[PDB]
Every structure is written in structure tokens, then in C-alpha cells.
Amino acid sequence: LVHVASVEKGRSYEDFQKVYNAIALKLREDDEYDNYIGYGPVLVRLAWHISGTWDKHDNTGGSYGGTYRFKKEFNDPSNAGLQNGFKFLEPIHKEFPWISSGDLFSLGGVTAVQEMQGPKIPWRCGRVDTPEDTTPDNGRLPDADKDAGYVRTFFQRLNMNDREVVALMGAHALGKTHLKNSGYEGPGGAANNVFTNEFYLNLLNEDWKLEKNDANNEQWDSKSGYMMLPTDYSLIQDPKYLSIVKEYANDQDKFFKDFSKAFEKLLENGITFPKDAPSPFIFKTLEEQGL
Ligand code: HEM
Structure with missing residues (x-):
């Protein structure tokens, strides 16, 4: 084609x-x-x-x-x-x-x-x-129940490299997961209909705990009332993705510039x-x- x-x-x-x-x-x-x-x-x-x-x-x-x-x-x-x-x-x-x-x-x-x-x-x-x-x-x-190796391999079909994948995933600050749509439940932060670098900051500063939800799926929950998908939590388990997450957490403009482009x-x-x-x-x- x-x-x-x-x-x-x-x-x-x-x-x-x-x-x-x-x-x-x-x-x-x-x-x-x-x-x-x-x-x-x-x-x-x-x-x-x-x-x-x-x-x-x-x-x-x-x-x-x-x-x-x-x-x-x-x-x-x-x-x-x-x-x-x-x-x-x-x-x-x-x-x-x-x-x-x-x-x-x-x-x-x-x-x-x-x-x-x-x-x-x-x-x-x-x-x-x-x-x-x-x-x-x-x-x-893509599936949500997976690790950083799957994420990287997936985004290669759309030829997105690491920085592009980390910037694109920053959109998960927005909205929420819903149990009847995807088997997952909960928001990812406080400002979920304003676009900010909040996803990265929550991934680096919350005390995440692995729990099963009402659908029988795992997710990472925090004291604050927030959740992260296994694929989201992957970005701090991989050393390459983790240096990028930290960069956006320290710099929302650089995040805006890279999200725009990707x-x-x-x-x-x-x-x-x-x-x-x-x-x-x-x-x-x-x-x-x-x-
Ligand atoms: C490996 C990559 C990804 C996976 C597995 C994934 C998966 C999911 C899942 C399971 C939900 C919840 C659906 C629901 O129950 O309503 C969700 C929500 C959402 N996703 Fe993703 N996501 C991925 C990548 C992205 C990317 C690249 C973007 C945007 C550029 C994105 C944007 C959104 C948005 C904005 C929501 C919130 C929707 C709402 O509030 O109804 N996702 N994601």
C-alpha cells in the first residue's frame, strides 16, 4: 500500500x-x-x-x-x-x-x-x-498486563523509539481506566483533564502497591487513590525508560515539545x-x- x-x-x-x-x-x-x-x-x-x-x-x-x-x-x-x-x-x-x-x-x-x-x-x-x-x-x-520488553517491541511496529514511547505514554495522566471497558479501575493522578507532566511525577513519587482489582487483574495502587497499569509501571523497571521519565518529571516543557512531535x-x-x-x-x- x-x-x-x-x-x-x-x-x-x-x-x-x-x-x-x-x-x-x-x-x-x-x-x-x-x-x-x-x-x-x-x-x-x-x-x-x-x-x-x-x-x-x-x-x-x-x-x-x-x-x-x-x-x-x-x-x-x-x-x-x-x-x-x-x-x-x-x-x-x-x-x-x-x-x-x-x-x-x-x-x-x-x-x-x-x-x-x-x-x-x-x-x-x-x-x-x-x-x-x-x-x-x-x-x-497493545495489552496492559505486560512488561517493558513487550512495550518496546510493540511500539517498534509503529516505529516509535524510546523517547517517543515515554512522551506518548504521558497522556495516561488524562482520564481514568474504567472496569466495564478494560478490566481496570481508577485514575492516574489529581489533574486528569488538564495536560501536565503529572504522570511522571506520580510514577516517581508515589508508594505503589501491587493489588488485584475486582476484575482479577493486577494493577499498581497508591495511598493517594491513584492506579498505574503493569505497562505503565514498566517505565520505571526499565533503565532506559526510567532516565526519560525523570527528565520529563523535571521538565514539563521538554515533555510538551517531545509529546507534540511524537x-x-x-x-x-x-x-x-x-x-x-x-x-x-x-x-x-x-x-x-x-x-
Ligand atoms: C502500551 C500502551 C498502552 C496501553 C496498554 C494502554 C491502555 C489503556 C487502558 C487499558 C486504558 C483504560 C480504558 C478504559 O477502561 O476506559 C487506557 C486509557 C487511556 N489511554 Fe491508554 N494505553 C496505551 C497507550 C496510550 C497512548 C500512546 C495514549 C495516548 C497518546 C493513550 C491514551 C489514553 C487515554 C487518554 C486514556 C484515558 C481514556 C478515558 O478517560 O476514557 N494510551 N489506556
Whole structure:
């Protein structure tokens, strides 16, 4: 496969900035979801799961085809609970029927991060919806019950190196695990709908204790009321990952700069951009626009 980026016919910066402004305004408004966490967390988890099925060996999966729209990928056990992020974005697609699915799912994520006071993520348009038979089979997204060797081996299929994996995993400060979705339960820190380096600081400063939960799975619990997945706790069991964790815990700007770069890379894997194509867009936030 080659998947060439094709701009939605006739659209420019300002059209895209209007879909962003509309996702951000609905984030403002539906602020009660998940005990007042808001939809920002489930929207960045949707943008990483439509991108994470990519395989570098044969160019299949990835954000291009918008294939989550199909039953097979939608009903994937690893995608439980994302139906909420889909439902949120659905009125927005009716308001802007020209944007592709891959471009909408992926800009949902960019919008959520920047509105949650995260860094600016450059975003590129051009994904083209592809047929139901391009839909990747289930089982390409990662297990939580595993160690640092699995994490490193997994992220190599998406060719992410160590620093990229540690920066990408800093998004687990956001939101929470939920027992009926994934067999895991609990939040990862205090500020779970603001984007900060809190995940690293909690991983280095809490007294974590291994316990089984109501699903019969293990997780790392702390006195404070927080949890960490086995795969999250892996980042301090590996000496290479641990020097990176410490760096971000001492420097939130360096974390913002590396998350920005790696999140964009994750959203654009498997896509070729012609150089006639527009430069990546930097969208303004509501606040920046006085809205
Ligand atoms: C080895 C890697 C990863 C594993 C095993 C993993 C697994 C999980 C699991 C089990 C949950 C809880 C789902 C639920 O019950 O609702 C979760 C939540 C979440 N994940 Fe990951 N994750 C990984 C990587 C990432 C990456 C790379 C990102 C983002 C760039 C990410 C973002 C999120 C977000 C934002 C949530 C919170 C969702 C919510 O509040 O509903 N994850 N993760």
C-alpha cells in the first residue's frame, strides 16, 4: 500500500479551524461526562487507537482510511468505551459533511490536547476514507498486563523509539481506566483533564502497591487513590525508560515539545504527503480567538 494524502476539495485553513472551533465549543459545553472529567480524555484515546493499528511492514491500518466507522474495528474488544467519543463527534460530522472520517477522528485528539492546556500539535489534512475491506483485523492494539520488553517491541511496529514511547505514554495522566471497558479501575493522578507532566511525577513519587482489582487483574495502587497499569509501571523497571521519565518529571516543557512531535508522528504514520500539499496547520484555541 501507498496512501497518498488528498486535501478535501476546495478547503483551506479557515475551514479546518471551524471544525476545531466546533469540537472545542462542544468540549466546553458537555463538561459533565464521566463525573466531570469531560470528553477530552476519551477523544485523545480515540485518536491514538485509530492510529495504532498501523503496521510498518505492509502499510496496513493507521489513521488514513477512517475504518473505525466499520463494525469490525468499532466492536474490537480493545476499543470498548470509545463509542462515546464517536457519538460526541457525530453531530459535528453532520455539520461539516465534507471532512473525511480519519481527518475528523484525528483532529478530535489535537483539539482535546490543546484545549486541555497542552502543547500546540501541528496537524495535516488529507486522509481519504477507504472501503470496508481495508478495515484491519482485531488484535493489533497493545495489552496492559505486560512488561517493558513487550512495550518496546510493540511500539517498534509503529516505529516509535524510546523517547517517543515515554512522551506518548504521558497522556495516561488524562482520564481514568474504567472496569466495564478494560478490566481496570481508577485514575492516574489529581489533574486528569488538564495536560501536565503529572504522570511522571506520580510514577516517581508515589508508594505503589501491587493489588488485584475486582476484575482479577493486577494493577499498581497508591495511598493517594491513584492506579498505574503493569505497562505503565514498566517505565520505571526499565533503565532506559526510567532516565526519560525523570527528565520529563523535571521538565514539563521538554515533555510538551517531545509529546507534540511524537503525537503528530503517530497520527501521520502510513501516509505519504505530496510536496504540493499544504504545510501542517497550527490551530488557534478558543481563548486565543476570544470565543
Ligand atoms: C502500551 C500502551 C498502552 C496501553 C496498554 C494502554 C491502555 C489503556 C487502558 C487499558 C486504558 C483504560 C480504558 C478504559 O477502561 O476506559 C487506557 C486509557 C487511556 N489511554 Fe491508554 N494505553 C496505551 C497507550 C496510550 C497512548 C500512546 C495514549 C495516548 C497518546 C493513550 C491514551 C489514553 C487515554 C487518554 C486514556 C484515558 C481514556 C478515558 O478517560 O476514557 N494510551 N489506556
